[PDB]
From Swiss-Prot:
GO terms for cellular component: cytoplasm; small ribosomal subunit. Protein S19 forms a complex with S13 that binds strongly to the 16S ribosomal RNA. It comes from Thermus thermophilus. The chain holds residues 8 to 80 of 93 of the full protein. One of its GO terms (molecular function) is structural constituent of ribosome. This is Small ribosomal subunit protein uS19. Keywords: Ribonucleoprotein, Ribosomal protein, RNA-binding, rRNA-binding. The keyword Ribosomal protein applies. GO terms for biological process: ribosomal small subunit assembly; translation. It comes from the Bacteria.
Length: 73
């Protein structure tokens, strides 16, 4: 159903421990955001591209539709 790139978390927990607000790339398949991304631009792997989305404490929970919920087309 939905999976969160653990490979991105392994790098975001490091940014949450030092306090660095950088970006974390991902290349799995159903890459989704998490709570640890509330201050990072993680390039979630949409299946073909890495979209570095700076997640806040409200866009996480899906994958990127919460960061780009601007209707369709």
């Amino acid at each position: 159903g939905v999976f969160v790139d653990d490979h991105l978390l392994e790098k975001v927990l490091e940014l949450n421990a030092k306090g660095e607000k950088r970006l974390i790339k991902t290349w799995s398949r159903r890459s989704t955001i998490v709570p640890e991304m509330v201050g990072h631009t993680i390039a979630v792997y949409n299946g073909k591209q890495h979209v570095p989305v700076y997640i806040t404490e409200n866009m996480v929970g899906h994958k990127l539709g919460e960061f780009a919920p601007t209707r369709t087309y």
